[PDB]
């Protein structure tokens, strides 16, 4: 993915919100972003 | 250490050519050349005695083992 | 000796000293200068010698000369 | 070539530095034969043929999509579909995630539908990330690279740098009459213990006919008899 | 020798104008050792050959060359006409410093008297850094006998 | 051409703090920073000069040029005053870059 | 008749040899050792301490060597040549001052003798300091021999230059096996530390140690440091728009894994792996153990107390590695003269001294405990009438150690073997040569290949000639002519003086400032990165030539490793060149008239600023000239002589460039065993083998170079 | 052309640089929306800041994270370290002239989180000398009474170093 949590700046996971939608959501501060993602590179 | 009495190669007696050459160069100043020329030798042996040769005895006697 | 080793410097200690003994000054062969081997055949010439060093031989066992 | 190369020899070692394999061609051309030889035999085309993998999250499923042009194919000649590219990862790796399922559609893409210490999902997705674009597609694995070149007249001969010698004569393109590789126990695997004397006292006398010191090769056919 | 550093600067020159037309064997940089280095050898063959043929008779090295006592044409001809190309390590010499060998040439110099090709021979009397440039490939030939 | 660089880029600082201390002249409720050499003399300022570069004469008229810094100050840099260990946290509030000042030799 | 300028300029070489001569690389080292040095080491154990009570201490105010009053500096010795026919040593006593004090707290001094040292010959010390030809004679001493050995039990040794790697400072050597390993060696005092930089696989980047168990991935430890951001861990090691945010991205994401969220966990697995536990204090373990650990008891020699510049330290030398993964060039070479540094006779001793004077207090406590305990009564005399049974080996292993070439020290783990060598005296030549000579000490012998080829980053600074035809080639080296090895001098006020000249401090820049110019690094240890470091160089280097004193603080660029690097911890070779300035040269002709004519001698162009010293990786920053016609408006420098490449022994040859070059080696060795003359007092001198000449003769051809030895 | 004068206008204060490392810029519209809640604490002796940020309630809150793990939170410190420097000076300007204060301290925000350490030391059981490093650290929670009343003012300041002259 390689975005970074604006509220604390550290490394935010891919999680399951109780079984069955993906959010993006990090350990390290209360924050959740439901937003599709995309990985593309040249 | 002394000048060698006889040259290597011929033969011919060098050893009464040193204080003479040593007299040549302080008084009556001339190149080494010139007066080694009007002292005897004419060939480049013989020449090469006089020319290059270092005089440690000189050296050598200030360390005298005797009473000094 | 010397095409297999290539001591062509040892050549120039010859000429730069047949003719520094002739006019009384011991020369320099220090490295990057020194003697030029110009004026040390020209030295050598005007005593009666050759410019190359390259003297006759008259031979010790035989007598005749060297060719 | 030197003293290392005759001690490679004698130790009869397992793996050596730098091999070689003398494959030769049929026919002459700079055509598609000549380039299609080798192209069948170099590995890891994935990194060139896809112009990105990236993973796309929908809400319950993840792709992993891969675009897959046809130009590539097009510039180097290589006989390979999109179900063969489907089969080349289906056998990609040996047992890493890679058993359930793949996809075709019709705009040439493939995306691996996945399924599950918590939250496992996006470690496997770097994981997975990261050891995709090293995977071979159309090719032969222990192979380094591969060399046409054109000899003293005007013929073709390839040369690679590998291990096989059974998959590279084993080849649409090439003639598995005559070869010859450096190895010894590479030909030992293959052909076998006469083959393998008949090897070694031509690869001695190659590392002296170069040099000069010609050892009257009796003497290398009684090294090459007490080895084998 | 002078028709033999203008046909190898012209492809300095070149390798910064873009690119050069690469042999398919290798990759820009060692197409261009390859192609310098062959000139820089074809340069002392050749000159080697003018000077043994102008050679006076009745002369040693070249009598000791033409029966087999010591010697080869090639060691009178490093003699007389040239020395050339210090090689070490089968290709030319590397880079001593960073992006250059020594720090009397300017920084990406691939010329051949910055980059080990030597043009004075024994008689005349090498350069510094002609010095230096055959001193470590004698350095490396002595040290391979210990 | 590292020479370049010294006269190209000077003459694009010298021009910043030239938009930053007279085009704000009026009232900025706003801070800043400078950085000055130490062993100072035991002043004078800027003195603009013919469109050219500025350079500080500071009093005891041995004389110490320099203007212009880097833009480390992307994050967010704001001052407070504090007293004896009372009351703190009085912030004025924005830093508009920095400069350095280098004596000459 | 006229003073040209191509030739007068040769006359710089003598001068250079006429106020420091070519033995000066033995002479100074030993001079500062005992003016500096050896008051330096009582300075760290200035007083004692005792388990009696704590009422009791000894306070050593000032050490010397041989000097109590108004009279002259032991106006007695023994002669330097009357204690080689006696098989003695040739030693000055070593003079201290203490203070002796009692709990009726009385307080005087007392002069002692607490051992021998012995005197290297004419340095300071010794009777042969600048003596009249008059006074060699009389003293049965030879006038030309160069002197800077030991006599020691009538024999002669001496201590040879020894090359090690740069000491504090990173290195990266590349494999294609298992991967690409960097080092950093720590110099402390206290212990010896080297901390490598392994990798295995993958870019899974984890530091290790010696003291230290299975190891940690270097996000963690640089965490547990002080780096907590995940923000400024991705954009201090990778740039902006780089390609080498792929690679460190993997040690991000098996941060996760571990213990992750700052150092209420990061910190207690960095503790948890640790070598050598340390029973004495043993129930800190928990946050106690590692701030230890990353401190000065391991890793390195930085005294901080919170870790911003440890922390970014560590997180350099991870650039310096994902640079060589995406580009296998950008590594370093162990063999270049840069990397290496030259230990020579006087910091070997202050190792020596260092370890015999710490076991001069252990075995002199356990002597003074006893007798302070079994009366009842407190002893007023007998404390200070007691070291003359102690302070003798201080004296017999200093000579121990000297005359059987063995240097062992318990606490420091460098022992080596072969250190001094017995002093070849063959001819005039050999005493020379040796005299002259650097040992590298090697790994292993089986596949070595590297440091024997002759590099071209040593012109000028070794010989290229004179290297041994045996076991030893190109293992064994020499100094040139006009070289000169430098110390340390402060190190302190260089870097306030950066501060001054306009670099900002590391704890004011954000952490994702090094987009922009060159960053400076003093000894290795990042500074702050100024911006316009061309400006920066070229008023640090006219500083340079106003007085700073010059020895070795230097300064060059680095533009593939995008850095400026200051050097003032010396140890180090440097030549001194002439300056051009932008057309032509600074020194002039009427510069060189003045030299043969009286004044303005050497030292003298250095404060004028007509020339420099320049080091190896410092003229990487320069373009030199060889000769005066060919000033190049972009040139830098122009050097003084072509021919002060060639050294010593390898300077007899006439007409080197001519030959080919494995004949003016060869020559190098059969230089030194050939028979002569040997010294002028060699017919009042007995040693077990010396070789002589009948009738001695000068050569024919001489050198430039042989009028100066 | 003119001068803009500068003076060190006086010293008897003490001043201090926050320096947030984690909020850079809202590129438009007059950015950086510096915050208003905080009213933190200060230790002096290991110099040992800390300062705190409210907690946005209605937006991507994620309550279950929030109150299962640890407790209900609404602040988040921040912790820094000060160290001395010199010659670093801050600057205003009014009209036609620049008046120089000395600033005497430079830190940095770096946010240190501290409910981690409270649910740690919750769910556990649910020496005279050191010599530097050692006593640096263990001396860094004792007195921490300076709960501060946040506050703000251009009279204190600016009319105190322009009646100097
Ligand atoms: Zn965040
Ligand atoms: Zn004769």
Redesign the pocket.
Same mark, same amino acid.
């Given at each position: 993915m390689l975005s970074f949590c604006p509220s604390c700046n550290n490394m935010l996971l891919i999680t399951s919100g109780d079984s069955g939608v993906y959010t993006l959501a990090c350990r390290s501060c209360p924050y959740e972003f439901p937003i599709e993602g995309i990985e593309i590179y040249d | 250490m002394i000048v060698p009495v006889r &040259?290597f190669? +011929?033969g011919?007696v060098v050893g009464d050519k040193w204080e003479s050459y040593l007299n040549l160069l302080q008084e009556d100043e001339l190149d080494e050349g010139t007066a080694l020329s009007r002292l005897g030798l004419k060939?480049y +042996? &013989?020449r090469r005695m006089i020319l290059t040769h270092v005089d440690l005895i000189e050296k050598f006697l200030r360390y005298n083992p005797l009473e000094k | 000796g010397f095409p297999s080793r290539m001591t062509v410097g040892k050549m120039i200690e010859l000429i730069s000293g047949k003719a520094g003994v002739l006019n009384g000054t011991l020369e320099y062969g220090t490295c990057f200068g020194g003697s030029k081997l110009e004026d040390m055949s020209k030295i050598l010439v005007d005593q009666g010698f050759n410019y190359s060093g390259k003297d006759m031989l008259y031979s010790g066992i035989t007598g005749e000369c060297l060719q | 070539l030197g003293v290392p190369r005759i001690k490679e020899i004698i130790n009869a070692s397992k793996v050596i530095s730098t091999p070689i394999i003398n494959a030769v061609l049929v026919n002459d051309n700079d055509e598609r034969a000549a380039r299609v030889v080798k192209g069948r035999v170099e590995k890891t085309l994935l990194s060139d043929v896809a112009f990105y993998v990236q993973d796309v999250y929908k809400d319950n499923l993840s792709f992993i999509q891969v675009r897959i042009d046809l130009g590539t194919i097009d510039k180097l000649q290589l006989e390979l579909t999109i179900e063969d590219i489907a089969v080349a990862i289906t056998r990609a790796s040996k047992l890493k995630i890679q058993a359930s399922d793949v996809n075709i559609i019709g705009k040439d893409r493939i995306a691996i539908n996945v399924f599950p210490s918590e939250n496992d999902v996006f470690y496997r997705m770097q994981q997975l990330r990261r050891a995709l674009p090293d995977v071979v597609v159309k090719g032969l694995p222990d192979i380094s690279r591969a060399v046409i070149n054109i000899r003293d007249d005007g013929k073709r001969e390839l040369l690679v740098e590998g291990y096989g010698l059974r998959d590279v004569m084993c080849t649409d393109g090439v003639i598995g009459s005559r070869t010859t590789t450096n190895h010894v126990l590479e030909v030992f695997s293959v052909l076998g213990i006469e083959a393998a004397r008949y090897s070694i006292i031509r690869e001695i006398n190659y590392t002296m006919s170069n040099h000069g010191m010609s050892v009257d090769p009796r003497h290398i056919q009684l090294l090459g008899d007490v080895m084998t | 020798v002078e028709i033999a550093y203008h046909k190898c600067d012209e492809l300095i020159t070149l390798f910064n104008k873009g690119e050069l037309e690469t042999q398919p064997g290798c990759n820009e940089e060692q197409t261009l050792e390859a192609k310098i280095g062959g000139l820089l050898s074809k340069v002392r063959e050749e000159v080697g050959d003018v000077c043994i043929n102008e050679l006076d008779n009745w002369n040693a090295p070249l009598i000791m060359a033409t029966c087999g006592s010591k010697g080869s044409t090639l060691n009178v001809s490093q003699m007389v006409a040239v020395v050339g190309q210090q090689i070490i390590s089968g290709n030319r010499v590397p880079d001593g410093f960073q992006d250059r060998s020594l720090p009397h040439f300017p920084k990406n110099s691939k010329t051949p008297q910055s980059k080990g090709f030597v043009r004075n021979s024994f008689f005349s009397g090498l350069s510094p850094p002609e010095f230096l440039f055959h001193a470590i490939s004698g350095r490396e030939g002595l040290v391979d006998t210990a | 051409k590292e020479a370049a660089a010294e006269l190209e880029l000077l003459n694009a600082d010298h021009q910043h703090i030239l938009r930053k201390l007279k085009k704000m002249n009026n009232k900025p409720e706003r801070f800043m920073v400078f950085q000055l050499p130490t062993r100072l003399p035991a002043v004078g300022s800027i003195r603009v000069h013919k469109s050219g570069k500025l350079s500080v004469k500071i009093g005891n008229v041995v004389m110490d040029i320099g203007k212009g810094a880097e833009t480390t100050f992307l994050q967010d840099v704001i001052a407070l005053s504090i007293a004896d260990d009372a009351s703190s946290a009085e912030l004025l509030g924005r830093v508009d870059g920095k400069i350095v000042v280098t004596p000459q030799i | 008749d006229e003073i040209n300028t191509a030739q007068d300029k040769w006359h710089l070489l003598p001068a250079f040899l006429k106020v420091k001569g070519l033995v000066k690389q033995h002479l100074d080292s030993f001079n500062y050792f005992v003016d500096t040095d050896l008051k330096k080491i009582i300075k760290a154990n200035q007083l004692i301490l005792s388990d009696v009570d704590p009422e009791f201490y000894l306070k050593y105010v000032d050490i010397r060597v041989g000097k109590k009053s108004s009279s002259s500096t032991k106006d007695y010795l023994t002669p330097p040549h009357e204690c080689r026919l006696r098989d003695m040593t040739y030693s000055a006593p070593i003079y201290v001052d203490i203070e002796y004090t009692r709990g009726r707290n009385i307080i005087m001094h007392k002069d002692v003798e607490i051992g021998r040292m012995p005197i290297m010959l004419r340095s300071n010390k010794c009777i042969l300091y600048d003596a009249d030809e008059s006074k060699m004679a009389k003293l049965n001493e030879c006038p030309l021999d160069p002197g800077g050995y030991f006599i020691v039990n009538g024999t002669e040794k001496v201590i040879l230059v020894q090359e090690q790697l740069s000491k504090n400072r990173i290195i990266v050597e590349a494999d294609e096996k298992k991967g690409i390993v960097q080092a950093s060696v720590t110099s402390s005092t206290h212990e010896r530390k080297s901390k490598t930089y392994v990798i295995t696989k993958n870019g899974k980047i984890y530091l290790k140690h010696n003291s230290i168990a299975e190891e940690i991935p270097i996000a963690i430890v640089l965490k547990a440091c002080g780096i907590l951001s995940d923000l400024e861990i991705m954009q201090l090691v990778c740039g902006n728009d780089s390609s080498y945010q792929d690679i460190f991205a993997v040690n991000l994401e098996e941060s996760s894994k571990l213990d992750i969220y700052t150092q209420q966990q990061a910190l207690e697995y960095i503790g948890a792996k640790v070598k050598t536990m340390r029973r004495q204090k043993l129930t800190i373990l928990q946050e106690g153990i590692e701030a230890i650990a990353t401190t000065v008891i391991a890793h390195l020699t930085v005294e901080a107390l919170d870790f911003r510049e440890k922390a970014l330290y560590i997180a350099m030398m991870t650039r310096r590695v994902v640079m060589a993964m995406y580009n296998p060039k950008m590594i370093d070479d162990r063999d270049y003269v840069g990397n290496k540094r030259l230990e020579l006779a006087g910091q070997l001793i202050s190792l020596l001294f260092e370890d015999l004077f710490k076991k001069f207090n252990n075995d002199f406590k356990l002597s003074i405990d006893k007798v302070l305990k079994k009366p009842n009564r407190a002893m007023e005399y007998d404390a200070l009438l007691s070291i003359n049974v102690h302070s003798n080996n201080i004296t017999s292993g200093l000579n121990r150690a000297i005359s059987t070439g063995n240097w062992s020290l318990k606490r420091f783990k460098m022992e080596r073997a072969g250190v001094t060598h017995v002093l070849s005296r063959l001819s005039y030549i050999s005493a020379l040569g040796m005299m002259t000579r650097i040992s590298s000490q090697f790994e292993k012998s089986r596949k070595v290949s590297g440091p024997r080829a002759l590099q071209p980053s040593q012109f000028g600074m070794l010989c290229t000639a004179d290297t041994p035809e045996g076991e030893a080639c190109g293992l064994v080296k020499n100094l040139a002519l006009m070289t000169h090895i430098t110390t340390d001098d402060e190190e302190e006020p260089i870097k306030k003086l950066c501060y001054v000249l306009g670099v900002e401090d590391i704890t004011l820049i954000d952490s994702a400032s090094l987009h922009l110019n060159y960053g400076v690094y003093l000894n290795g240890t990042l500074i702050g990165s100024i911006r316009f470091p061309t400006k920066f160089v070229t008023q640090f280097r006219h500083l340079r030539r106003t007085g700073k004193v010059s020895e070795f603080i230097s300064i060059y660029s680095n533009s593939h490793q995008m850095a400026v690097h200051i050097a003032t911890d010396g140890g180090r070779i440097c030549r001194p060149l002439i300056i051009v300035s932008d057309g032509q040269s600074r020194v002039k002709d009427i510069h060189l008239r003045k030299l043969l004519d009286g004044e303005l001698d050497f030292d003298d162009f250095l404060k004028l600023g007509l020339v420099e010293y320049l080091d190896v990786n410092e003229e990487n920053d320069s373009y030199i000239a060889l000769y005066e016609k060919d000033i190049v408006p972009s040139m830098t420098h122009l050097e003084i002589e072509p021919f002060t490449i060639l050294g010593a022994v390898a300077g007899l040859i006439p007409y080197p460039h001519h030959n080919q070059s494995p004949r003016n080696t060869y020559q190098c060795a059969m230089g030194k065993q050939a028979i002569g003359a040997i010294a002028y007092n060699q017919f009042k001198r007995i040693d077990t083998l010396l070789y002589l000449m009948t009738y001695p003769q000068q050569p024919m051809v001489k050198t430039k170079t042989i009028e100066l030895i | 052309i003119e001068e803009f004068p500068l003076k060190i206008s006086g010293e008897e204060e003490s001043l201090h640089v926050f320096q947030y490392a984690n909020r850079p810029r809202l590129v438009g519209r007059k950015p950086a929306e510096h915050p208003f809640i905080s009213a933190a604490r200060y230790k002096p002796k290991s110099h040992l800041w800390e300062i705190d940020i409210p907690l946005d309630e209605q937006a991507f809150y994620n309550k279950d994270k929030a109150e299962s793990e640890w407790n209900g939170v609404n602040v988040q410190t921040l912790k820094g370290v000060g160290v001395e420097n010199n010659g670093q000076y801050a600057a205003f300007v009014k009209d036609m002239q620049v008046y120089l204060v000395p600033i005497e301290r430079v830190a940095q925000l770096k946010p240190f989180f501290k409910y981690i350490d409270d649910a740690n030391v919750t769910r556990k059981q649910e020496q005279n000398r050191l010599t530097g490093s050692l006593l640096a650290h263990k001396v860094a929670d004792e007195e921490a009474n300076i709960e501060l009343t946040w506050a703000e003012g251009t009279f204190e300041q600016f009319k105190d170093t322009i009646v100097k002259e």
């Open positions: - | &040259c190669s +011929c011919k060939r +042996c &013989c | - | - | - | - | - | -």
